[PDB]
Design a protein around this ligand. Structure first.
Ligand SMILES: Nc1ncnc2c1ncn2[C@@H]1O[C@H](COP(=O)(O)OP(=O)(O)OP(O)(O)=S)[C@@H](O)[C@H]1O
Ligand SMILES: Nc1ncnc2c1ncn2[C@@H]1O[C@H](COP(=O)(O)OP(=O)(O)OP(O)(O)=S)[C@@H](O)[C@H]1O
Ligand SMILES: Nc1ncnc2c1ncn2[C@@H]1O[C@H](COP(=O)(O)OP(=O)(O)O)[C@@H](O)[C@H]1O
Ligand SMILES: Nc1ncnc2c1ncn2[C@@H]1O[C@H](COP(=O)(O)OP(=O)(O)O)[C@@H](O)[C@H]1O
Ligand SMILES: [Mg+2]
Ligand SMILES: [Mg+2]
Ligand SMILES: [Mg+2]
Lengths: 338, 614, 328, 319
DNA sequence: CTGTATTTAT
DNA sequence: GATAAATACAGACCTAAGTCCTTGAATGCCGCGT
DNA sequence: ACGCGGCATTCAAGGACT
């Protein structure tokens, strides 16, 4: 399992040795540590590195996590509840679960823990892109005023949503995604420990290349194909693609084949079905655009128009609450291009 | 322009003004046709005597005319037909129209004479306190018996039967529905357009059957405390007025009991603290008849009332029924009324008898003869401006004629913006849901349907951006007309035309609620497995859930009931429960749907799994 | 304090109706109104810093005397814009008499454009009912916020942006009150950067006096004005525009970068100045004006949202170069 | 000066129904009602300053004679728009017994009735009918759409229209003759033009001109009353060349002190109400104006954005 | 617009 | 009595957001009676 | 002193915003 084998220390990390050395350099003298913002491709291992740095700074007990419930009150009388994972030396906040009220959670909880007080407690903002601009504006002074009591470490995937002052106030730690060889080595260690019979080792490289640099997805796909072949991987073992990938692929096939409003009926139907089942719209647009680009029939002009309209409707999605209102427009514009 | 004709020349002729006429617009042609007794219908049928179309006729409508063999004439044909046709319509149908007019006038005279006799008897009684001319025309001609109510005869009969058989159903404990079916409901609701006669009908049915009328205005008394106390001690109490009102005679046994006709039910306070939801619990446990009356039954505040009341939909009465009443009140008041303009009066007033009576009273002060010469000005000054329902907004906004060059002058852009502003919370959704299900008729030369759809969708994207700007922490409500344009008018103008199928309701609402529920479930699952998995909310659904299915559901598919122990170990490894398992099994889409898969699992396996987990 | 320890913006606030300059038509019209006694309901709508508040406060002083702060209901509409205000305070003040001397009542509403629509709908009858002994004055920077009904019962006076001569006279008065001197070119630059607002003039004058090493004997030149204000000099503007127009891209980038770095000028001010200069130009074709205006507007909007300064400057260079390339 | 003279609008407010100049049919109908009696329920709606409050007040005065003190209840709807008002004050006035001339009844005048909340309006529905024999309600409002449809049902829908220039000229001439003011035809025409049918604006402008300059001439009336903003905005929008639009903006709007938000809002309103331009071009200019409005409301309010909006509109018109 | 309900007509 | 005209009418109602407003319920303090 | 009795004040939910 992905959780079955996860490094619990800095010295157990095996990929991007430069990042490990940088983290140990920061951990050498921990009383002087700037605010951090872990960023890179999703699935790289940024959270694992952040928790390994926490274990290096503090004792080995940072992994003894406990969930707690802290009820909060918004501007109205509505009651809002947050699960705050906490450790004796650190606590974690994921504000993406809340909506536009992440500002309140920030300003109340972080100020409270500041008043509460190895003289600092690190707070991990796992989801920093879903933080609204108002929440970041409220967090802008919390970092600086209470810098002697609270030292934030931020987990992020793309720095574009994060505003300039927040990036300025915090140190940036780049996280390159693992290379295919390192992913294959990790998969080899897993299959060796999990006692999975391998006919050859090209299977591992194929899984590594089918994950696009993702290690979490790599391990999940490994175990997924380990259940369809009875814990014995063969050369012709099919690569397990998640359901939403298959649905998006069929969507691209339909857009490429039927460029009609009657096809737009079912296109909107599929978009609604995907959105209603906990699937973000930006991910839908990204995967849809890249799968459309992979269509061999379309020539260069169609590809360029598709990527142009993808960027335009990506901006529209980033500045719009109603996601399908932009997704349908993008699909219709692509149909008009074709 | 149009030559004059002798009166009622076009009587008994069914004329439909399908073609757009350059000389006169639709309403002017309809008025100049009704001036001579002609009948105008919106649907071409076998009974249609003549169809008037100069040019620009509907294609499907033209095929309908061709199949039904309806004669068609142009504007000049209409000009010549006005002179050609003889007076009073001769023709067999014209004779029938003559007879109908004569009977209507005869009943008008008879009721006028009856009213004069009643006034004479009242004068004699006074000789042996408010003077009659002091009273308004609405109250002085109010129906005194159920045979004078105009329209909705079936609703009146059903309500009368319900209130008559209420005692019999009470003896049966209301479990039995009865032959009519109005014996299982303790309370009845009368709802319809304002001024059609719900309150009068309720009062009259209460008076005829002998019950004691207790009237409470729900708008005046809407709080829980006042309504609670008053109406509760009213539900199970006899009438001291009913007892002291000559109980000795045995003709009316229902004199003791109460009929609580609660007027203006639509104005009660909403919410649990509001009494509109309390009355739902209140009316099922009552020992006296309840007659609730509201104007907008299809309201969110009135939802608790569908399953606890006998709905009764009073419709807008047709002008023919009110023709006799208007003729009577015109004969009595010494002002001349021509029945040809009565239909236009009702259409202008929109089936509101109270307002048409008020119009007759107010106009007659100066002008003693309401005729075809001043009907246009009367209509243009007295027309009801009623906010269109979110379905009629979708229909009209998605219409080719509205955005045409000729139609633009008739229906201006500011009118379109106001049409949006009638409902500013549902029109953008309705247009978005039904802008790509219409056959366009304003396509530019060299533009296909798909291009118009793409431009409209781009416009709706800009409108959604504008809406987010309006409905955010900045509250830029001064951009609301811009949102009206961007969301409703421009996208509809791009794809304007004829409605292909039906106007559906916005599906975004239900799917958004489903998304919120699934996000709540995913939040619970993610926070349950947080200790085991270092992921976010979205990443769990993206990646782990497919593998979680393979570690939970597939073992039940292949190993059988013996894989229960391993499944339980897997759930306990991440603190999952049966509810968590069910929620994850509902998260997959497309090829990996498990709704049929779980059904095909033997019931023994599922039962053993449940017992073992417990 | 002694009104000497206050900012020059509040220190030099007019106290009598004769110290308000620029709005001569409004001043004389209002003076004749009060002198003859037919003072109607006033509506002073104009740009900020045009003296509307100063004008109405001088009106209160000239009408009621030194005790004008107790015989006048001066309400900050931004601070209290509720319908409760209209129901209680405004209505009770209008209905009742004066506790001090016999006479009419004046209610000054400052920044009434922030009043809620319900408040204005309540006021449109309070104004009419108590017109016999009470007069209303409405001050609002924006007239669209005010309800049309409230714009029908009040006589409208427009406060134009302060012209050159009035600003020169006020600058001379300020220079006499202090011990300071201004060069004609420095005064011209201050007038140009004022944009018709005396608030900016006074703020910049105070800032330049602070900038002066020994304000007793030195003079505020145009260099001091431009440095303290931070606005770009016209010479730098002309040099940058000339370099972009008829020079190579490398030289144009070098010139823009050195101009920005040497004096610390912001890029947005450079764009505004370049727009001002090129507007004065006479252009052969319409398309170049359209392209220039559109691209520069998007560049300014993106700067308002922030971003990469160098990229935005290069975008300005490219837009200008392409627009004048269309003129061939 | 310690004391003030009464404004001409209130001093010369019509005290009889005959003095009202506009809406001849409605005034004659109300005069016939006043003479005969039995006043029906009504809502009077229209534009500001065309004589709605004056008409209802004259009707009440003439109908009730010496009994105006008790038979008339004056309640500004905006001031008193609560359900408590309907429950206590209106109800007690309606149930009040008062001996009147035979035809006449007690009159309730609710000025600015458009601002009444939903609860009070709904509560008034049964008070309107229950006590109709003794009490007759009258409503005056700017917009009748704010009044609920059932309340409109119970009353006569008497709708007013914008005053014609001839009637405003007649009233202005009457006041001029009564108060001995020197005038010119051009000045009176300009006052009528600036009033745009609002008689109250016309009389206030006449007052201002007379008091400030003493002569009603076109020059003075234009200096004291500026030209209407929508007309200059429309001229800017409908100019043939881009440079002409830029010049009109710079001279008439930006340099004269008009704000960016006012300019863009008036441009949007003019564009939506324009008739010569085809609807599609009108809509796309509305789109550009809305984008400029969004930028101004976000905070970029400058001459540059207005010039860019003009450039986009001119490109749109130039194909 | 399509689908359901009610009243006058054949 | 069934099937056509002839037409009125129902399809449906969401979650946030800032600020003012109103309405009813729950709350408090203060005056009168015993 | 000690307990209710209205009446002022504070709290909470719903609706609207061009
Ligand atoms: N069908 C009708 N026939 C004859 N007169 C009617 C009819 N409907 C209404 N009226 C007249 O209108 C008056 C008022 O009728 P109501 O029953 O109060 O109207 P409504 O349907 O209850 O609508 P409301 O009162 O606005 S909820 C009656 O007294 C009659 O004079
Ligand atoms: N016409 C003027 N004459 C002299 N000083 C002036 C004039 N206009 C503005 N000032 C100065 O600028 C200061 C601000 O004037 P105010 O009248 O408060 O501005 P404003 O016109 O009311 O605009 P606001 O406050 O944004 S609505 C005054 O105290 C004076 O020092
Ligand atoms: N250096 C490493 N060596 C071995 N496994 C790693 C390493 N870095 C990450 N992983 C694997 O990645 C998984 C967690 O990935 P995660 O940190 O959640 O991705 P993200 O960067 O998106 O947070 C762990 O189960 C762990 O096995
Ligand atoms: N038709 C008219 N004839 C004469 N004077 C009028 C007319 N309309 C308005 N006025 C003048 O306008 C002033 C106030 O108008 P008012 O009736 O309050 O406007 P509204 O109808 O908007 O309430 C009155 O003093 C009156 O002299
Ligand atoms: Mg009723
Ligand atoms: Mg001010
Ligand atoms: Mg009025």
């Amino acid at each position: 399992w992905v959780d079955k084998y996860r490094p619990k220390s800095l010295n157990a990390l095996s990929h991007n040795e430069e990042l490990t050395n940088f983290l140990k350099s920061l951990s050498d003298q921990p009383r002087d540590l700037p605010h951090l913002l872990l960023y890179g491709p999703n699935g790289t291992g940024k959270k694992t590195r952040c928790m390994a740095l926490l274990e290096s700074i503090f004792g080995p007990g940072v992994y003894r996590l406990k969930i707690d419930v802290r009820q909060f009150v918004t501007a109205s009388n509505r009651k809002l509840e947050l699960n705050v994972v906490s450790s004796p030396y650190h606590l974690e906040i994921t504000p993406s679960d809340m909506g536009n009220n992440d500002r309140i959670v920030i300003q109340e909880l972080l100020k409270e823990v500041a008043q509460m007080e190895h003289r600092y407690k690190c707070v991990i903002i796992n989801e920093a892109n879903s933080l609204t601009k108002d929440a970041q504006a409220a967090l802008r002074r919390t970092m600086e005023k209470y810098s002697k009591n609270i030292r934030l470490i931020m987990v992020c995937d793309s720095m574009s949503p994060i505003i300039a002052p927040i990036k300025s106030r915090c140190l940036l730690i780049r996280c390159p995604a693992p290379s295919d060889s390192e992913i294959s080595t990790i998969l080899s260690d897993v299959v060796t420990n999990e006692r999975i019979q391998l006919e050859t080792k090209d299977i591992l490289k194929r899984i590594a290349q089918a994950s696009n640099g993702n290690l979490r997805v790599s391990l999940l796909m490994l175990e997924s194909m380990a259940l369809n072949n009875e814990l014995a991987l063969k050369s012709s073992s099919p690569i397990i693609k998640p359901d939403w990938i298959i649905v998006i692929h069929k969507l691209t096939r339909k857009i490429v084949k039927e460029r009609s409003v009657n096809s737009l009926i079912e296109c909107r139907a599929v978009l609604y079905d995907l959105l209603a089942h906990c699937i973000p719209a930006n991910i839908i647009l990204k995967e849809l655009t890249f799968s459309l680009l992979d269509v061999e029939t379309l020539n260069t002009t169609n590809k360029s128009s598709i990527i142009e309209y993808s960027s335009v409707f990506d901006e529209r999605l980033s500045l719009g609450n109603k996601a399908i209102f932009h997704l349908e427009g993008f699909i219709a514009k692509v149909m008009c291009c074709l | 322009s149009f030559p004059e004709g002798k009166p009622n020349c076009l009587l008994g002729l069914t004329i439909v003004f399908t073609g757009v006429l350059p000389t006169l617009e639709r309403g002017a042609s309809e008025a100049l046709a009704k001036r001579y007794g002609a009948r105008v219908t919106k649907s071409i049928s076998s009974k249609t005597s003549v169809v008037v179309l100069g040019d620009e006729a509907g294609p499907k409508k033209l095929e309908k005319i061709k199949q039904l063999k309806i004669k068609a004439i142009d504007e000049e044909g209409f000009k010549q037909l006005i002179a050609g046709m003889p007076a009073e319509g001769d023709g067999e149908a014209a004779e029938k129209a003559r007879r109908k007019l004569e009977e209507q006038h005869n009943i008008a005279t008879k009721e006028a004479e009856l009213l004069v006799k009643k006034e004479e008897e009242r004068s004699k009684k006074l000789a042996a306190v408010v003077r009659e001319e002091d009273k308004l025309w609405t109250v002085k001609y109010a129906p005194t018996n159920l045979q004078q109510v105009c329209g909705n005869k079936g609703s009146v009969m059903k309500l009368k039967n319900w209130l008559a058989n209420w005692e019999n159903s009470k003896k049966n404990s209301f479990k039995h529905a009865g032959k009519d079916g109005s014996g299982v409901f303790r309370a009845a609701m009368l709802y319809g357009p304002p001024g059609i006669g719900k309150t009068t009908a309720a009062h009259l049915v209460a008076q005829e059957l002998g019950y004691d009328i207790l009237e409470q205005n729900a708008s005046d008394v809407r709080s829980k405390t006042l309504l609670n106390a008053g109406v509760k001690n009213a539900l199970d109490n006899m009438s001291v007025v009913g007892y002291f009102k000559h109980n000795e005679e045995a003709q009316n046994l229902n004199g003791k009991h109460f009929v609580i006709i609660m007027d203006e039910v639509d104005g009660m306070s909403g919410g649990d603290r509001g009494g509109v939801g309390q009355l739902a619990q209140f009316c099922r446990k009552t020992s006296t008849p309840l007659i609730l009356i509201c104007n907008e039954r299809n309201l969110p505040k009135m939802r608790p009332f569908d399953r606890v009341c006998l709905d009764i939909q009073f419709r807008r009465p047709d002008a023919n029924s009110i023709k006799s009443r208007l003729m009577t009140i015109a004969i009595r008041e010494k002002f001349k009324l021509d029945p040809n303009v009565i239909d236009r009066l009702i259409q202008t007033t929109r089936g509101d008898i109270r307002q048409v009576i008020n119009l007759l009273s107010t106009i007659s002060t100066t002008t003693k003869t309401i005729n075809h010469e001043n009907i246009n000005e009367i209509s243009k000054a007295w027309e009801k401006n009623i906010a269109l329902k979110p379905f009629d907004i979708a229909h009209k906004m998605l219409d080719g004629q509205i955005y045409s060059d000729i139609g633009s002058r008739n229906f201006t852009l500011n009118d379109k913006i106001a049409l949006y502003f009638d409902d500013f919370d549902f029109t953008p959704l309705m247009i978005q849901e039904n802008y790509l299900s219409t056959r366009p008729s304003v396509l530019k030369p060299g533009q296909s349907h798909l291009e118009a759809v793409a431009e409209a969708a781009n416009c709706i994207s800009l409108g959604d951006i504008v809406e987010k700007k309006i409905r955010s922490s900045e509250q830029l409500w001064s951009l609301l007309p811009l949102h009206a344009v961007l969301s409703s008018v421009y996208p509809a103008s791009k794809v304007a035309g004829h409605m292909a199928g039906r106007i559906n309701f916005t599906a975004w609402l239900g799917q958004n609620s489903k998304s919120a529920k699934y996000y709540r479930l995913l939040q619970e699952i993610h926070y349950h497995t947080r200790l085991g998995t270092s992921t976010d909310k979205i990443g769990l659904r993206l990646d782990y859930l497919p593998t979680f299915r393979k570690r939970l559901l597939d073992p039940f598919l292949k190993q059988g009931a013996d894989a229960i122990s391993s499944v339980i170990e897997v759930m306990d490894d991440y603190y999952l429960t049966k509810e968590d398992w069910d929620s994850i099994m509902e998260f997959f889409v497309g090829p990996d749907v498990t709704t049929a898969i779980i059904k095909k699992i033997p019931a023994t396996v599922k039962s053993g799994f449940t017992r073992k987990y417990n | 304090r002694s009104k000497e320890n206050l900012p020059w913006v509040e220190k030099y606030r007019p106290e009598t109706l004769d110290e308000v300059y620029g709005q001569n038509e409004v001043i004389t019209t209002v003076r004749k109104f009060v002198d003859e006694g037919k003072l109607p309901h006033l509506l002073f709508y104009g740009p900020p810093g045009t003296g509307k508040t100063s004008t109405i406060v001088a009106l209160a002083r000239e009408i009621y005397g030194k005790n004008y702060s107790n015989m006048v209901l001066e309400l900050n509409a931004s601070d209290d814009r509720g319908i409760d205000v209209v129901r209680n305070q405004i209505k009770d003040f209008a209905s009742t008499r004066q506790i001090f001397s016999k006479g009419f009542k004046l209610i000054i509403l400052d920044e009434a454009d922030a009043m809620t629509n319900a408040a204005q709908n309540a006021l449109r009858r309070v104004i009419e009912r108590y017109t016999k002994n009470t007069r209303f004055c409405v001050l609002a920077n924006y007239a669209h916020k005010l309800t049309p009904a409230l714009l029908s019962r009040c006589t409208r006076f427009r406060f134009q942006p302060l012209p050159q001569e009035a600003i020169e006279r006020r600058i001379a008065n300020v220079l006499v009150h202090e011990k300071l001197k201004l060069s004609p070119n420095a005064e011209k630059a201050l007038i140009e950067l004022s944009n018709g607002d005396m608030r900016r003039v006074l703020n910049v004058l105070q800032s330049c006096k602070a900038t002066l090493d020994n304000p007793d004997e030195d003079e505020i030149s145009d260099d001091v004005i431009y440095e303290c204000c931070g606005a770009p000099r016209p010479s730098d503007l002309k040099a940058v525009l000339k370099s972009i127009l008829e020079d190579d891209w490398g030289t144009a980038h070098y010139t823009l970068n050195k101009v920005r770095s040497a004096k610390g000028l912001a890029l947005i001010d450079l764009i505004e100045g370049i727009v001002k200069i090129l507007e004065d130009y006479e252009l052969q074709n319409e398309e170049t004006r359209v392209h220039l205006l559109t691209k520069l507007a998007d560049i300014e909007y993106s700067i308002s949202k922030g971003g990469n300064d160098q990229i935005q400057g290069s975008a300005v260079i490219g837009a200008i170069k392409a627009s004048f390339e269309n003129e061939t | 000066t310690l004391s003030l003279q009464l404004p001409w609008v209130e001093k010369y407010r019509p005290q009889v129904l005959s003095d009202i100049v506009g809406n001849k049919e409605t005034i004659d109908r109300l005069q016939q009602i006043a003479k005969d009696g039995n006043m029906p329920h009504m809502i009077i709606s229209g534009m500001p300053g065309i004589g709605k409050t004056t008409s209802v007040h004259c009707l009440a005065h003439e109908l009730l004679g010496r009994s105006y003190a008790d038979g008339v209840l004056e309640l500004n709807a905006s001031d008193d728009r609560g359900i408590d008002v309907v429950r206590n004050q209106i109800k007690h006035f309606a149930q009040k017994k008062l001996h009147l001339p035979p035809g006449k009844h007690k009159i309730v005048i609710l000025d600015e009735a458009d601002s009444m909340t939903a609860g009070a309006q709904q509560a008034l529905r049964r008070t309107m009918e229950l006590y109709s024999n003794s009490t007759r309600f009258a409503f005056a409002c700017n917009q009748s759409n704010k009044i609920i449809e059932p309340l409109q049902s119970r009353c006569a829908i008497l709708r007013y229209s914008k005053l014609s220039d001839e009637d405003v000229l007649k009233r202005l001439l009457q006041i001029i003759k009564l108060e001995d003011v020197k005038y010119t035809n051009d000045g009176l025409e300009a006052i009528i033009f600036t009033a745009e049918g609002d008689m109250r604006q016309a009389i206030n402008n006449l007052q201002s001109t007379v008091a400030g300059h003493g002569l009603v001439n076109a020059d003075n009336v234009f200096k004291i009353v500026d030209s209407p903003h929508p007309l200059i905005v429309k001229k800017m929008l409908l100019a043939s060349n881009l440079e002409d639009s830029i010049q009109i903006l710079r001279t008439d709007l930006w340099k004269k002190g008009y704000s960016s938000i006012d300019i863009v809002t008036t441009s949007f309103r003019v564009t939506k109400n324009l008739a010569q331009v085809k609807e599609s071009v009108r809509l796309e200019m509305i789109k550009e104006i809305g984008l400029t409005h969004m930028r101004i409301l976000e905070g970029v309010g400058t001459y540059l954005q207005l010039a860019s909006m003009l450039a986009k509109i001119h490109k749109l018109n130039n194909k």
